[PDB]
Amino acid sequence: DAGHGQISHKRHKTDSFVGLM
C-alpha cells in the first residue's frame, strides 16, 4: 500500500502543533 503512507501525513499535523507552543 503506497497510499497508506498518505494517511500518515495526517500525523504530521501534530508536529506543526509543537511549533504552536
Swiss-Prot record:
Whole-protein residues included: 72 to 92 of 115
Protein name: Neuropeptide gamma
Taxonomy, superkingdom: Eukaryota
Annotated positions of the Methionine amide modification: 21
